[PDB]
Symmetry: C5
Subunit: 196 residues, 5 copies
């Protein structure tokens, strides 16, 4: 097997529409914040840029003197239907939409995303700063099909008007009126402020 | 049958172009708006910027499958399904679909589709900054299918509404109508969702 | 024939790239604008932002079917039909199509397409804030098909009560114009929108 | 041959990825800008927002057909044709194509494509508000094809909007052949000089 | 071989999904930014709007052909080629590609791709209106391919193609190459840092 063969196989046998459940798919989500571009304390809206690190297992991609990994167009893979509940724009994907697939079927996808959110911006210009909570989960898959779990400034722009004080991550299971099942989400709390 | 098989069948066999009429009866579509946020109101221009889950429900028997020893539901790309051609009459921007465009299909052919949508509308914003608030009428119906092909029907208000909005929801009421338009002889159905909201105090 | 069969046939035999001309003659296209809203006006730049239903009508016989015991009409994705290449000459943005892009096809091959469109135009906005108002002229015609191939003809009821503006009158004029580039004449309809700001 | 056959043949046979080079000579492309409107000007930033028909003409013999008893012309989706990779060097936005993207093909293989385009440019806007006006120079040429592959050649207010805040004083066209540092070959361009000025309310 | 044959061949057999890594070594990608314009600067937000030719160079042997009696080069739609997944780390808008998206392929498999791009960046704009000017750092590298698979290296005059009508002028351009690790991953990924030193014109 060479890269070409591996990539050919994944393409022809790829089943993107099909959730790779084994005998729920455990999805890991983590936001790596890169920049905060605009803030509005009046409207409670922020414009953020972050790497959305997403991790899961699709055994149907696995393979046996060959490369251990390849980069694969996500259009050829099943991807979890994650959405940000309080996003107020559709995510602008900044980077090439490639996933990374390991021979055992593990998948990394980590696009850089710019997106606007509705959240608590109050206090942004104080010592203690604002704490903006972003809620991400599967849109249509309940807890028996997809589970999400977590995994501050390492990649954060030194040239932003703002700075990051802290990032905390909390996991939840919520029942919505529309449906009987519980749907999991991760809540990323971004604590930031305008700089002195 | 496993998920893969079900989704393969749907892929191959589903007909997105074909209205799942039964015996020349109209497809009964259920519509309900779950308001999430109100982003920018303009009392001068009478325009509002709203975010809502558009909960849409209908039956397409051609999707059904014997679920005796199979999954009861699957998530399906709406590009693989027939979807009702609903439109908001008083929308002034095309709908921005925020969420993955997946429908949920039950073994008996019932379909849920509930994308989160951001869309600007032209409606009555007068009084938005009063006790009584504004009452914004959003009108949604089939664009091209009359009452004998498609029928629309309604199904907490603020249950999913953002606590961080500058606004608050006082009430949401849903009214159903049947309208005849100058272009065409037939009647076309619509649901009118009345959103009663106001600016929050200082 | 049921809907499925009709739609299968149309998809299997549709030539979306081929203008359905009856012998040497031109396809008769009907165009009519049903104004829904006026959103933004600029009397300085002479630019208006308008929302209108673009009612378009023509005949494609190749779509017809024996409806003796079959549905009389179906809704069809316009990607599966030939559509006239109409454009607004004085549009300054590409048309934003607001509604599902479905046409309506009758068993005899008549086609209705009426999407709701938001588009900005360049036109005379002067006087918009006077009792007599502005008169904004919008010119729509086939872009590449001349009069021998395509002919266009005209056909507040749906106007938003919440617009800052009101419609005084709408008139439609059809024209045939010769352009520098080409020897042939190209037809267009001119819709004159007479509107003003409200009290 | 009817229209359907002609369009089928072209769709199934024509090759858009392939430059219609005849006899190892360059494809002669004609370019001409028909200005329709000037929408926004900024004398500070030296940026203009313009709308123009981009009249483009060339020969692709591989499209030709015996029109003895057939239509002389058809309209064809440009996605089905080879099109010259023309670009405006000083454009600062990608071209917004306003019209249906149809070319016109004559039985002998001549092609007209004339979409209406809105695009913003960086150019000399100084003097826009004077009697002589500004002269905004627009440079168009093949992006990747050098002079032995593609040659560009030229051919004012006729189609210009009476409702623009501006008016056109003159349009001149100049043709050039330039060698860029990056590459050994010469690349041709046409420079359209737009001479315009602000009208007054 | 004529152009048509070569292009039929490339199209028919080219795998855009496959990194053309010869014998286990990394594909050597050359990157160079030719700045064309600076359109808007904001010293407060530290954001710049830039237009540049992104000169990109690499080898894909699988494209090569015997050019004994054939054309030496062709222009090819990049959708038909493998292209390195380069991204600007500090870009804050997705790149607007201004030019036709054609690569140039030489008979030996060398590829040039040089689109003109307009993109906005977050970087140090401080001092833009002084003698020494601002120095805006742009970081470009492979997004998913580490140093064993893709290596990036720099490629003349900063202002050779720069617009004389810009409100700004270029004082200097320097290029630095680095090798950096990231949390998600054990391997090192290469990048080139282009330092753009510019200021307001008189
Ligand atoms: Br179809 C379909 C089913 C459920 C949902 N949601 C409800 C369940 C949890 N996520 C929020 C969206 C959306 N579309
Ligand atoms: Br095709 C076709 C037929 C009817 C309509 N309209 C009229 C009836 C109801 N919705 C408004 C649009 C639009 N397109
Ligand atoms: Br191809 C081709 C030929 C002619 C035209 N125009 C000129 C004729 C009337 N409509 C305006 C555009 C556009 N494309
Ligand atoms: Br590939 C490739 C090679 C050269 C160029 N340019 C240089 C030659 C003339 N136009 C400027 C763009 C663009 N793409
Ligand atoms: Br898949 C995948 C793997 C790694 C990364 N990143 C880390 C390596 C360098 N570029 C930044 C993003 C992105 N996507």
């Amino acid at each position: 097997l060479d890269r070409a063969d591996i990539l050919y196989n994944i393409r022809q046998t790829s089943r993107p529409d099909v959730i790779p459940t084994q005998r729920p798919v455990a999805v890991s989500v983590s936001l790596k914040f890169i920049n905060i571009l605009e803030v509005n304390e009046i409207t409670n809206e922020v414009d953020v840029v972050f790497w959305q690190q997403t991790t899961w297992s699709d055994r149907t991609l696995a393979w046996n003197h060959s490369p251990d990994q390849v980069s694969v167009p996500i259009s050829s893979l099943w991807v979890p239907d994650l959405a940000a509940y309080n996003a107020i724009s559709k995510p602008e994907v900044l980077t090439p939409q490639l996933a990374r697939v390991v021979s055992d079927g593990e998948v990394l996808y980590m696009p850089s995303i710019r997106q606007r959110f509705s959240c608590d911006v109050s206090g942004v210009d104080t010592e203690s700063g604002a704490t903006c909570r972003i809620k991400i989960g599967s849109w249509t898959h309940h807890s028996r099909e997809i589970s999400v779990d977590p995994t501050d400034s390492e990649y954060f722009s030194q040239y932003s008007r703002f700075e990051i004080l802290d990032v905390t991550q909390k996991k939840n299971s919520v029942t919505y009126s529309c449906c009987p099942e519980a749907y999991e989400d991760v809540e990323v709390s971004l604590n930031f402020r305008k700089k002195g």
